[PDB]
Design a protein around this nucleic acid. Structure first.
Ligand SMILES: [Mg+2]
Lengths: 175, 37, 122, 215
RNA sequence: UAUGUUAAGUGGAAAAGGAUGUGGCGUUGCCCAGACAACUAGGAUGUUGGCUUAGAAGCAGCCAUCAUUUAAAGAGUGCGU
RNA sequence: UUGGCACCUCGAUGUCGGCUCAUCGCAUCCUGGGGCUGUAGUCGGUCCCAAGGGUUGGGCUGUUCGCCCAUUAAAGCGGUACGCGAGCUGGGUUCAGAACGUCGUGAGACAGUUCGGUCCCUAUCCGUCGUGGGCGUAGGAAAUUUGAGAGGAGCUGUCCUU
RNA sequence: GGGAUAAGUGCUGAAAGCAUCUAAGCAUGAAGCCCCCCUCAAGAUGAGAUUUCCCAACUUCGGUUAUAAGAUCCCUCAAAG
């Protein structure tokens, strides 16, 4: 697991607590607590973390690479943070906030409301560019997928909630 | 989706993967998605 | 209660004098029809001339059955003879001179051209 | 919430506002009393036990259900009430809202409530397939010797038996039936009468249970 | 008991075919001058030059397919009509 | 399905249609959910998941089948002795009568037509649908109950608004 | 209207410093599955629960009468047969 071993972790002014197997990572924007793979061993130097697998058995060399990048995700999201931006394409497609909630008018004869959750913030700009921000990558991604699944892009004119900088295969159907 | 006993690449960009015990093909061309193998 | 093979007098000057019902429209298994229900029918007797000729397969709307209808207040209306009027697929009549009394329950089904053209609506 | 026990008097008709014929059933609900409070910690579930009508007191050498026996008198004397002829219990009600010995009164219902009424249907006795089960009958002419029999009861040697629930002749009626989403038309407090819209199961002078619609 | 294999309830019915499932044995060529990876570093020139074809210059088809600005460069690996 | 074989049954296992009553499979006719589309939308096409419910009435034929007339959201395909005659029918088919064509010298024959032509049985057992008695449930009773389990329901059209 | 799913759609993510719905992990998703709704049900021999009623006097030791509470026989009936 070149991911797991070769690229070691580099905490930057963060507090990681290798509390047995249960790991707890806190920094400027909150605290994250995940339970990593049991068999793996963790070596923590001055502001550096390294993951070591026991055997080179396919399973061990698979959980190693997984649970190194998972901890790297925690430190990078608690020190830097994670953002996902979604563009709304289509005449009359708007996005407005309603207090810890996000309301969309995407041409459905009824507004669609997504309530925010803990550790997650929504924002809007130019009534089109929705923004999801948070510390946990696995939850910001989930929320962004939920918001785009309200109306994913269509192939004939691209209308719909797309990821920003997402290639939309465009067809040329004719009236 | 194509579900057929013969799952093979159709393009150079086609990828053969195994999900949940099934042999599939994923390609950026949606016509080349294939399920069972 | 008009079902298939039921003879009906026609109450207009369209050309048809009697019709037999082939089918009651409105659903699978539908068996009977009352005032305001539309039927398909074959004309069995016609006047010489007129637009409807003997043997034609036409739509008609039922007016004034002898089974009669109940009203929401518990009042019933019954008639002496089953009757029908040939319609033009826009719920509009083919004749111009509807004869005989007509039940008021047709006003709901948007047969307003039939309802207005009848000497008596009851 | 808010159930009650009564007996069916008959059917009649009332004219609503704007004057529509409303077929109604008259239900007489009088001397309803709460006789017990079933509680989770004592019974495993909460309910109120309601007694209805009025038995005569215990007497020596009673020969019919008209007089309460000692078990029933003692049970109804633990609350302060006369022996009752019909005892049911209700789960949809909130037990804390009720108190043992209190009188479930007719005006717990208000006109426009939507109710479920439970009765025992009218008896029909030994009845055949075409009435008990709505089955069609065979031809009445054309040499037919099949008029009101049930049809085949099965297949041939594969099976070699009749499956359970074949819809064969037997005793019709007398079953517990619940009619749903009926509405009370008016309440008469002096006559202690609920007018329910439509018809309810059972013979005249039977027993009906009214309670709030579960839907 | 010892040593291995299988993850499919295979064991406890089938085939042509299809498949980065997985273990064993040998061959073989790339290699710390540093392959294989996206290594987010450049991608173009006279020049589609010639048949240039609906005008079409990585697509309707004969390719003539010349050296490289260059640590590495193809009259364009290649998605395209 | 049409066959092959001749293994059970000739001291009898009634064969086609229809009626009555169903029951199961899913290779799904409709309705529910999807992927791909040479899917602009309404329309479609094809494949995948799904058996919960539903899945028409007539004319002609003994007909199954089929064609046609009108419907329908749809008029699904199969198994159950081509389900079901100790549940019904008896139009076809397969006795005895008669006739036509045809074959035979003839008696007669044809899976060629045509008219006619007895459908028995009081249910012992299992099974099934309903109803009672006995004992049990560690005293003898009256009533009110929980719910382990089991069964039932489960379909869908059109119009208005957006 | 809830819970779990099918086909499917995913998010995070290594095997394979890339990609990747899957291996670990987390979603979402059908008239179908379980519950919800209706009815029956403790012979549920696993025979359940609650409230109430009855409670002695011989024994020569009950293998005990006869009675309580409660039922019935029998009789008048129907909302039931
Ligand atoms: Mg024998």
């Amino acid at each position: 697991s070149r991911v797991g071993k070769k690229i070691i972790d580099i905490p930057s002014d963060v507090t990681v607590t290798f509390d047995g197997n249960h790991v707890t990572v806190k920094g400027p924007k909150g605290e994250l607590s995940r339970t990593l793979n049991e068999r793996m061993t963790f070596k923590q130097e001055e502001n550096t973390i390294e993951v070591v697998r026991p055997s080179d058995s396919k399973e061990d060399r698979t959980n190693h690479g997984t649970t190194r990048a998972l901890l790297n995700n925690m430190v990078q999201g608690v020190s830097q943070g994670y953002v996902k931006v979604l563009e709304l394409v289509g005449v009359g497609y708007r996005a407005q906030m309603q207090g810890k909630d996000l309301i969309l008018n995407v041409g459905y004869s009824h507004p669609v409301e997504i309530k925010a959750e803990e550790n997650i913030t929504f924002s809007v700009e130019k009534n089109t560019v929705v923004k999801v921000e948070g510390i946990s990558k696995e939850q910001v991604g989930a929320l962004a997928s939920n918001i785009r699944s309200v109306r994913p892009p269509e192939p004939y004119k691209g209308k719909g909630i797309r990821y920003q900088g997402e290639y939309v295969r465009r067809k040329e159907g004719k009236t | 989706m194509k579900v057929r006993p013969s799952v093979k690449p159709i393009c150079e960009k086609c990828k053969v993967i195994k999900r949940k015990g099934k042999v599939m093909v994923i390609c950026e061309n949606p016509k080349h998605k294939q399920r069972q193998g | 209660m008009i079902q298939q093979e039921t003879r009906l007098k026609v109450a207009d000057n369209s050309g048809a004098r009697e019709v037999l019902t082939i089918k009651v429209l409105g659903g699978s298994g539908r068996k009977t029809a009352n005032i305001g229900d539309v039927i398909v029918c074959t004309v069995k007797n016609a006047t010489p001339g007129g637009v409807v000729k003997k043997g034609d397969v036409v739509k008609a709307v039922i007016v004034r059955t002898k089974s009669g209808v109940r009203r929401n207040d518990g009042s019933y209306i019954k008639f002496d003879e089953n009757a029908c009027v040939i319609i033009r697929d826009d719920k509009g009549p083919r004749g111009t001179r509807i004869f005989g009394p007509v039940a008021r329950e047709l006003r709901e089904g948007n047969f307003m051209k039939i309802v207005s053209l009848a000497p008596e609506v009851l | 919430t808010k159930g009650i026990l009564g007996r069916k008097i008959g059917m009649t008709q009332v004219f609503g506002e704007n004057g529509e014929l409303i077929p109604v059933t008259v239900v007489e609900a009088k001397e309803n009393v709460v006789l017990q409070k079933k509680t989770v910690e004592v019974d495993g579930y909460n309910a109120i036990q309601v007694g209805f009508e009025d038995k005569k007191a215990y007497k020596k050498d009673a020969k019919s259900n008209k007089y309460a026996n000692k078990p029933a008198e003692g049970h109804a004397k633990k609350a302060d009430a006369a022996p009752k002829r019909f005892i049911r219990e209700f789960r949809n009600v909130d037990v804390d809202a009720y108190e043992v010995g209190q009188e479930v009164s007719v005006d717990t219902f208000v006109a426009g409530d939507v109710i479920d009424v439970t009765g025992v249907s009218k008896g029909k006795g030994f009845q055949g397939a075409i009435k008990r089960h709505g089955q069609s009958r065979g031809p009445m002419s054309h040499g037919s010797h099949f008029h009101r029999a049930p049809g085949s009861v099965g297949m041939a040697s594969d099976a070699s038996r009749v499956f359970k629930g074949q819809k064969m002749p037997g005793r019709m009626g007398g079953n517990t039936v619940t009619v749903q989403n009926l509405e009370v038309v008016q309440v008469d407090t002096e006559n202690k009468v609920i007018l329910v819209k439509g018809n309810v199961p059972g013979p005249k002078k039977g027993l009906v249970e009214i309670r709030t619609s579960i839907k």
